[PDB]
Amino acid sequence: SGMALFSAQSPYINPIIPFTGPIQGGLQEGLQVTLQGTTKSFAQRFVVNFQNSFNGNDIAFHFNPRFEEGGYVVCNTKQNGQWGPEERKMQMPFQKGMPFELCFLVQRSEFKVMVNKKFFVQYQHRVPYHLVDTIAVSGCLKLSFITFQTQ
Amino acid sequence: SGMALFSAQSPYINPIIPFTGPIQGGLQEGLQVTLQGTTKSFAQRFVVNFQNSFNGNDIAFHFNPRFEEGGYVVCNTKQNGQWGPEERKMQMPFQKGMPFELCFLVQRSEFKVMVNKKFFVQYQHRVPYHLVDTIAVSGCLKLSFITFQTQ
Numbered sequence: 001s002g003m004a005l006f007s008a009q010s011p012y013i014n015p016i017i018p019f020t021g022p023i024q025g026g027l028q029e030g031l032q033v034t035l036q037g038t039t040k041s042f043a044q045r046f047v048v049n050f051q052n053s054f055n056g057n058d059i060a061f062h063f064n065p066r067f068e069e070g071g072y073v074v075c076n077t078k079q080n081g082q083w084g085p086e087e088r089k090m091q092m093p094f095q096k097g098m099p100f101e102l103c104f105l106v107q108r109s110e111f112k113v114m115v116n117k118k119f120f121v122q123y124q125h126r127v128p129y130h131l132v133d134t135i136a137v138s139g140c141l142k143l144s145f146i147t148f149q150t151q
Numbered sequence: 152s153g154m155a156l157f158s159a160q161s162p163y164i165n166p167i168i169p170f171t172g173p174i175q176g177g178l179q180e181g182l183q184v185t186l187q188g189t190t191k192s193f194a195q196r197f198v199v200n201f202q203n204s205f206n207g208n209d210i211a212f213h214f215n216p217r218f219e220e221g222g223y224v225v226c227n228t229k230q231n232g233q234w235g236p237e238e239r240k241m242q243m244p245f246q247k248g249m250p251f252e253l254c255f256l257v258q259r260s261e262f263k264v265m266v267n268k269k270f271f272v273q274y275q276h277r278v279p280y281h282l283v284d285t286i287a288v289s290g291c292l293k294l295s296f297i298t299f300q301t302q
C-alpha cells in the first residue's frame with residue numbers, strides 16, 4: 001500500500017467517545033496512527049489531540065476540523081494551558097455523517113496528516129513528539145478503530 | 152551562520168517595487184532566497200510570489216502577510232488563474248514601518264520560511280519548484296536586496 005506496515009501496539013477497536021488512551025512508549029519516528037470512523041450528522045467540530053498525560057494542558061498536536069465558515073481545520077500546540085499560533089487550512093476534507101480514514105505519520109521534523117488516503121496537512125513539531133504518550137479523541141463521531149503501525 | 156553559503160545568482164540590490172525578476176535557471180534544492188527590506192507605515196498587505204513566468208497565472212508559492220484581523224499570513228498556490236486551499240498562520244512576524252529579513256529555503260518536499268532569523272512557516276510543494284523562474288514582490292515596502300545562495 002506503498003509500504004509494508006507492522007503493528008507497534010495493539011489497536012483500539014471500537015473505542016468509546018470521548019476517548020483518552022495511551023500511546024505505548026510514546027510517539028516514535030515512522031509511527032502511523034490511523035483512525036477509522038464516522039462523523040455524526042449533528043457534528044460541528046471534532047478533535048484529535050496528541051498529548052503528554054491525561055489532563056490536556058500540554059498538547060503537542062491538536063488537530064481540529066471545524067464544520068464552520070465553509071469548513072476548515074485548525075492545527076495547534078498547547079503548552080502549560082496556553083495555545084500557540086494557529087495554523088489553519090481553509091479546506092474541509094471530511095463530510096458530515098460520512099466515513100473517514102484519518103492517518104497521522106510521525107516524521108523527524110513534522111507530522112504528515114492524510115485524510116481518505118490523500119495528503120491533507122503537515123505540522124512542524126513544536127515540542128518533542130516522544131513526550132506524547134496519550135491520544136485523546138472527542139466530538140460527535142464514532143470510531144471503528146485506531147491502529148499504530150511502523151515500517 | 153549555521154552554514155557556509157555561496158551566491159547562486161548575483162543579488163538584486165535596491166530593486167524597484169513592484170518588482171518582477173528572473174530566478175536564473177529556476178529554483179533549486181537548497182537555494183536560499185533572502186529579502187531584506189522595510190514595510191511602509193501605510194502597508195496593509197504585501198506579497199512575495201514564486202511563479203512560472205511574468206503573468207502571475209501560475210504561482211507555485213504565494214506568501215502574503217496581512218496586517219488585518221490582528222495580523223496573519225496566507226500561503227497558497229495559483230494554477231491556471233485559480234487559487235487552491237489557503238494555509239493561514241494566525242501570527243504576524245512583521246511590524247509596520249520596521250526592517251525585516253525574510254528567507255525562503257527550498258527543500259525537497261517543502262519551502263521553509265524564516266522571518267528575522269526565526270522559523271515562521273513551512274509550505275509543501277504543490278507543483279515542482281524548478282518550474283519557478285520568476286520572483287515577484289509587491290506591497291507598500293522597500294527592499295535593500297534579494298540574494299540567492301546555496302550550501
Ligand SMILES: CC(=O)N[C@@H]1[C@@H](O)[C@H](O[C@@H]2O[C@H](CO)[C@H](O)[C@H](O[C@@H]3O[C@H](CO)[C@@H](O[C@@H]4O[C@H](CO)[C@H](O)[C@H](O)[C@H]4O)[C@H](O)[C@H]3NC(C)=O)[C@H]2O)[C@@H](CO)O[C@H]1O
Nearest residue numbers: 068069070071090213215225226227228234235236237238
Ligand atoms: C458551499 C458554500 O456555500 N460554502 C460557503 C463558503 O464557500 C464560504 O467561503 C468563502 O467562499 C468564497 C467564495 O465564494 C471564498 O472562497 C472565501 O475565501 C476567501 O477568498 C478570497 C479570494 O480568493 C481570498 O483572498 C485572496 O487570497 C489569495 C490567496 O489565497 C490572494 O492573497 C488574493 O490576493 C486574495 O484576494 C481570501 O483569503 C479567502 N478567505 C478565507 C477565509 O479563506 C471563503 O471564505 C463561506 C464564507 O462566506 O460560506 C460558506 O457556507
Ligand SMILES: CC(=O)N[C@@H]1[C@@H](O)[C@H](O[C@@H]2O[C@H](CO)[C@H](O)[C@H](O[C@@H]3O[C@H](CO)[C@@H](O[C@@H]4O[C@H](CO)[C@H](O)[C@H](O)[C@H]4O)[C@H](O)[C@H]3NC(C)=O)[C@H]2O)[C@@H](CO)O[C@H]1O
Nearest residue numbers: 062064074075076077083084085086087219220221222241
Ligand atoms: C492587539 C490586538 O488588540 N489585536 C487584536 C487581536 O488580538 C484579535 O485577535 C483575536 O484575539 C483573541 C484574543 O483576544 C484570540 O486570540 C483570537 O483567536 C481565536 O482564539 C480562540 C481561543 O483561543 C481560538 O479557538 C480555540 O482554538 C484552539 C486551537 O487554537 C482550540 O481549538 C479551542 O477549542 C478553540 O476554542 C480561535 O480559533 C482563534 N481564532 C483565530 C481567527 O485565530 C484572535 O482572532 C483581533 C480579532 O478580534 O483583533 C485584533 O485587533
